[PDB]
């Protein structure tokens, strides 16, 4: 029963990013089944999954073909390691397919179990690369305040969430942070395009404050996900790239979210028009059907790692055959069923138009934004004056609770509301989701006013 | 073909703990199928897997029931996150079953994708614990030289492999290391039991040097795996535990290898008779059939973490439903099919007797050792003098290459040779494996002499 599952969960399970005592007193929501864009819970609610699991179930729920690929691989060879001068066909075939869907010059992939492990891999690869170049001082990686790069000690350090830094005595050494390109807060009297150049040049100013000979890499999500779908101006990434090339700093895209079609390009960096030296992946790589991540290593960094002999790094389940077989089915479906192309040409433009049509009218909604199948808005105290609520996050929590009670999953990141539904969502699904979201915002506005805004 | 698979692997795949240029020149061995204790490669060789994948395929290859459990869960609900005050039946049922097979006082489990992530989780938990206790200086974790705790930045820093420290600028702060309890090298004129007390007192020396008020935890593998199946004396772990309790230091077992039956007990700390405050797991948790790890949190540390409110840590695939369903089937089989009990009562004692009967006679083999279904020996230049070969690892590589050419997988850790076969191996299989190993060592002794070493 719901009761028994909640009691066992409270007794035995510690959840990610959770206040355990609060969750155990409230009761966990038990999700039992998924099909297309929908979920069911243990109380029989049918739920619109406007978050695709956690930005990751890109082909939607219910792929029986993926379950068959897993079953077949698991019966033949459930596991073999890639440590003993050994490989297996599933990881070879996935590596070959991944070279076809990635840009030219990304031939070589290193596998992990998660986006967090891909980020730690990338940190060790970047530092190893500069050692092989004979630059042992070039070790600092620069991230952003409100960037998210996972939950390993490495990834939490590179990320810019102070609430994670405060648990574990982070960041570790050789990590620095610049402000995020959040125009609504930091744009002063500028247009987004003017601001994009200013926000990019924060990187150059930080490189010069530290010393360029000490800086290994700049790492960024093309769009900041957990930070609230912070979509940088069009001028931002070309300027970041120019600054990285000027100082001989590696450029790293964290594609764990934007990867595998979320923007309508295969990768977020293709949408924003920059060319990273390496990029990190997970999530959409297998649509979340099994845990797998990757680091895609460009030609320059690959040659440096190869010139360095032993790379003393990796995970038991790196290249796991069952995970590789499911990822292969998933990437083959994204390409061969035209799912990525449909985001670029059809459902992305429709979602973006309908999202702006739906939210733009609300008194306490501003900065309506998105690309492809990631979109967001911010809850604001005064739209005219672009004033935010104090205690950023309290009002976002009120709004997300209304969504959840109405069987719609959209997440609050502070007072940002975000959505990243399965890429296969139909136009009709998009309209159904926006109709429920619109009713939830009307209730939100009524509640604000009733309670004294 | 073998040729086509090797060419694609060389072009596209970066392997864990590998010299890529050397592997791509040699050609990777392509493993295609597994059954019981055996593997087949792309050239049709049948191979005895004396390493159970990578110390992890505890129930052996060919569990069609596990593939069915994976298929069924993947069709129903392939993924849902445990972040949104959400849970799902598979992770609840696994959490309940794990409380039944773990010692009393380990009710609460935190899920990861890997042993490395479990170690990073444990480091952030132990630091968070001491913050909640109001001891914010108590942050240093102590490990051992030649200890292995994974390949995240955190796990590589806590581990004691200098060849990992040198790639990534590790260890991170708040990490210290003591010498390993390796009697053959460090025991001088002591008995093993005398040496166990001296080697444990190295921990006391390190605590007093740092200051107990700055030390959060001591972390150790019950038996050092990747370091070469370093089996400590019987006096070691009781003395470690006495020292940790004296100085108010948490005691952490890394059970990633010893866990899930490898010693004949469910966990290595039960064999060696110490009670850790937390322990890390992966590998045998799912017999490697899908990626999953865990941190088992004892009552005292669990209460501290719960009293701390939000724990700002976790992974997208934490508690992954498909991985949890397979882990559940695996743990149920270990208990209900009597597999762990059989290691303790039957196959463990048989292996340990036959291992000692097989190797003890060879002129350049010494320190023949093991417990349950993990066993090892050291290749030595002169047994009388306990003189090791120079360039520790070169002679182990020669010996491992003979095994691999004879379709037997045993791993070299420097000049240690180690074995950890599936726990379901039959007595007959054990004799088959030992007969091949014996012939390989005869060849090894002939090759040593032929080459003047
Ligand atoms: C941009 C980014 N990078 C890294 C990670 C970490 O991935 P994982 O949770 O699979 O460890 C995430 C997870 N949301 C992410 O969004
Ligand atoms: C004791 C120990 N701890 C942690 C790890 C890391 O586990 P993983 O490779 O699954 O990240 C290993 C891996 N062999 C290990 O042997």
Residue numbers in the entry:
A (entry chain B), B (entry chain A): 6 to 458
Please quote the authors directly.
The cryo-protection of single holo-Cv-ATA protein crystals in the presence of the amino donor 1-(S)-phenylethylamine (20 mM) led to the conversion of PLP to PMP in cristallo without producing any visible crystal cracking (Supplementary). The final refined structure model (Supplementary) contains two homodimers per asymmetric unit, reciprocally oriented according to the same weak translational pseudo-symmetry described for the holo-form of the enzyme and each showing the same overall backbone folding. The clear discontinuity in the electron density between the cofactor ring and the K288 side chain (Supplementary) justified the modeling of the cofactor moiety as PMP in all chains with 100% occupancy. In agreement with what has been observed for other PLP-dependent enzymes, the conversion of PLP to PMP is associated with a small combined tilt and twist reorientation of the cofactor ring hinged on its pyridine nitrogen (Supplementary). The side chain of K288 was modeled with 100% occupancy in the forward conformation with only the three most terminal side chain atoms tilted away from the amino group of PMP (Supplementary). The PMP·Cv-ATA structure shows that, upon breakage of the K288-PLP Schiff base linkage, neither K288 nor the other variability regions rearrange to their apo-conformation on the seconds time scale of cryoprotection. Since the actual reaction turnover is expected to be orders of magnitude faster, it can be concluded that these structural rearrangements do not occur during the catalytic cycle and must be the outcome of a different process. The newly solved PMP·Cv-ATA crystal complex confirmed that none of the known conformational rearrangements occur on the second time scale of crystal cryoprotection and, by extension, during the much faster time scale of catalytic turnover. Recently Börner et al. reported that Cv-ATA incubation in the presence of an amine substrate results in enzyme de-stabilization and explained this observation with the possible diffusion of the non-covalently bound PMP away from the active site. This is in agreement with our model, as the conversion of PLP to PMP releases the K288 from the Schiff base constraint and enables the K288 reorientation to the backward conformation.
Amine transaminases (ATAs, EC 2.6.1.x) are enzymes with great potential in biocatalysis for the enantioselective synthesis of chiral primary amines from pro-chiral ketones. One of the main factors limiting the implementation of transaminases on an industrial scale for the synthesis of chiral amines is their poor storage and operational stability. In the present paper we have described and validated a possible inactivation model for the well-characterized homodimeric (S)-selective amine transaminase from Chromobacterium violaceum. Computational and experimental studies show that the stabilization role of PLP is exerted primarily at the level of the catalytic lysine K288 and secondarily at the level of the PGBC.
